[PDB]
Structure 1
Amino acid sequence: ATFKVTLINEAEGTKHEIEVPDDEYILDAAEEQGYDLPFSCRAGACSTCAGKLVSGTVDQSKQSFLDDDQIEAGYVLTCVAYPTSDVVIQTHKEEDLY
């Protein structure tokens, strides 16, 4: 499968559409497709690459930073998240945690 991923940057009012394989992390695909996104650890242990789901789902089982409540609230670590449906996500959401 290949999923459609819509990247929305609310602060800058930008929107990017990318296609991501079901076995590729969102971050990687974005970069390959020409859209640089924030990151630091690239290992699911920080909050630099955080995004917030608008719609769709993902598999971010490799993540270790977010707690259950943050996950329920829709936050995703883009560096270790695989899309599991078409997804709409707001990027650059780190500041939202604090």
Structure 2
Amino acid sequence: AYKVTLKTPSGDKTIECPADTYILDAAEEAGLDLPYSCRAGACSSCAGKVAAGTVDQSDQSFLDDAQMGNGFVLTCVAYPTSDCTIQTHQEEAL
């Protein structure tokens, strides 16, 4: 699996996430407790910010082009495409 380093307000926690699993789902499976609501890519509750590595969030429908260009990601609909580092709890930074 890809190694996803979640940089959370309570420390960095590196978890495994296969290519076919959403970041949020892998995080909750690993025992993390990240924000979410719709789980449909249509809000900002689950927003993170990619610091390194790549994700595929093609089905997202809330972030604009500039926000995605700055690394913002909807973790509920984002797959990893490499080992990656994602700062969590980023909704207030949007």
Q: TM-score range by the shorter chain?
A: over 0.9
The separation in 2 between residues aligned to 1:39 and 1:80, in whole angstroms, is 11
Structure 1 unmatched ranges of 5 or more: none
Aligned to 2:65: 68
> Structure 2: which amino acid aligns with 1:88?
T
Percent of residue pairs identical: 68
TM-score (norm 1): 0.93
2-structure distance, mates of 1:13, 1:44: 25
Indicate the RMSD between aligned Cα atoms, in angstroms. 0.8
1:36-85 Cα distance to aligned partner (Å, 9 max, x none)? 11001000000000000110000000100001111001000000000000
Counterpart CA distance in 1 for 2:31 and 2:63 is: 27
Cα offset, 1:3, TM superposition:
0.4
* Runs of 5+ unmatched residues, structure 2: none
> For 1:31 and 1:90, how far apart are their aligned partners in 2?
15
TM-score, normalization by structure 2: 0.97
- Displacement over 6 Å in runs of 4+: none
In the aligned structure 2, how far is the partner of 1:70 from the partner of 1:15? 23
2:55 is aligned with 1:58: yes
